[PDB]
Write a protein that binds this ligand. Structure first.
Ligand SMILES: [Cl-]
Ligand SMILES: [Cl-]
Ligand SMILES: [Zn+2]
Length: 163
């Protein structure tokens, strides 16, 4: 398993613009288009992102392209951040993936705000981190997804994702 497969399971794949669980316009593999309520604004953004008049629909390949770009950006977000990098650098491969997943979902800034959990993870206090991470809006709004990520941080294995 790897980050891509992991995120593909958590985000799914949709080829037509859709409203996500937060009520925003998204497409492909969790690719947010706009937090605005206008579909037009979302189509504009889509065309801009893809480089063609899409009419709100894209191909698998195009979705995969947005996805590669998005995963790249999450990583770069991590590496650039003073609070995230040192943690990331302390972790094993599986756990790094769980950090990336969160950054992809919520943004570098968002994750950087989990001071306490970050600190526990850096100290390798897994069980503690996992409890702390669950005390969040993130967990409460996405219990199944959040449980898969937290487990991954807890065990360092891909178990939550096997299926
Ligand atoms: Cl793009
Ligand atoms: Cl969920
Ligand atoms: Zn959400």
């Amino acid at each position: 398993m790897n980050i891509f497969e992991m995120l593909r399971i958590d985000e799914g794949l949709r080829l037509k613009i859709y409203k996500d669980h937060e009520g925003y316009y998204t497409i492909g593999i969790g690719h947010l288009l706009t937090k605005s309520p206008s579909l037009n604004a979302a189509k504009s953004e889509l065309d801009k992102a893809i480089g063609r008049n899409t009419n709100g629909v894209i191909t698998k390949d195009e979705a995969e392209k947005l996805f590669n770009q998005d995963v790249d950006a999450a990583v770069r977000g991590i590496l650039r951040n003073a609070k995230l990098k040192p943690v990331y650098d302390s972790l094993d491969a599986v756990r790094r993936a769980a950090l990336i997943n969160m950054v992809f979902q919520m943004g570098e800034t968002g994750v950087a705000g989990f001071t306490n959990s970050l600190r526990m993870l850096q100290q390798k206090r897994w069980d503690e981190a996992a409890v702390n991470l669950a005390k969040s809006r993130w967990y409460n709004q996405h219990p199944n997804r959040a449980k898969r990520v937290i487990t991954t941080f807890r065990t360092g294995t891909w178990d939550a994702y096997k299926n």
